Amino acid sequence: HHHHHHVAMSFSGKYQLQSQENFEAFMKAIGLPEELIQKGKDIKGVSEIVQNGKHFKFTITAGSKVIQNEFTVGEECELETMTGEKVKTVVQLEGDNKLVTTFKNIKSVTELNGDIITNTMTLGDIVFKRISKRI
């Protein structure tokens, strides 16, 4: 389907988990089983994001399970979580390579930075944080 007008700073590629902070507090705060927390911290995860204009895929694989999400920025779309719940929410984008979406009181923020993907999720007082890099 050609180059389809190539755009710079697109969230398009594949990224392995480097590290993560407040994982055990956050994965407990959403209510995943304590075995899947204590093993899933050492299971090396991967994410695979695809910006297609206003459309966005967000794939995440960790703990031997896969999550796929689809949304479109400026529109309302149903985002799936680690617990398997789906909730409707609007996603926003800023002119600094950032995304923002809020689901189940989990205030997710993402940022593309060259080849590196930063993620943060703030639920109540738990400030979860995530670091991934291009593979």
Side-chain angles (χ1 to χ4, degrees):
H1 52 260
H2 311 287
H3 293 163
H4 191 234
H5 183 86
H6 258 42
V7 170
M9 310 267 54
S10 286
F11 303 68
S12 63
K14 212 185 196 188
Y15 320 92
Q16 188 201 283
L17 188 72
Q18 301 303 291
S19 66
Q20 54 192 349
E21 287 174 75
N22 294 325
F23 174 84
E24 303 183 312
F26 180 77
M27 211 110 304
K28 180 247 290 179
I30 62 175
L32 257 61
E34 191 172 311
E35 170 175 36
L36 191 59
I37 307 177
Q38 269 60 72
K39 299 195 313 197
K41 58 146 175 60
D42 302 356
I43 298 285
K44 62 99 71 181
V46 174
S47 181
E48 180 173 26
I49 316 168
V50 188
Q51 182 171 8
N52 287 325
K54 300 297 93 64
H55 188 80
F56 279 86
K57 264 197 173 187
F58 266 79
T59 306
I60 305 171
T61 300
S64 289
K65 58 84 77 68
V66 180
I67 309 89
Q68 282 197 84
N69 282 323
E70 279 183 37
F71 65 85
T72 297
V73 296
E75 300 290 310
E76 185 176 81
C77 289
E78 221 172 294
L79 284 175
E80 194 172 305
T81 64
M82 300 286 186
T83 64
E85 282 95 288
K86 304 196 68 152
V87 296
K88 283 200 175 186
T89 177
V90 176
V91 187
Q92 295 299 335
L93 175 140
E94 304 179 280
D96 197 60
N97 323 323
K98 301 168 82 85
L99 286 161
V100 178
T101 180
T102 309
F103 56 86
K104 302 163 66 67
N105 208 42
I106 305 157
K107 181 76 171 188
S108 181
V109 177
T110 311
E111 178 179 277
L112 168 69
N113 227 260
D115 307 320
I116 316 301
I117 301 302
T118 298
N119 271 94
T120 295
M121 302 185 170
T122 304
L123 199 189
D125 198 36
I126 309 305
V127 181
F128 181 55
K129 194 267 225 169
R130 269 271 293 281
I131 305 85
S132 281
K133 174 260 178 296
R134 176 176 283 179
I135 50 163

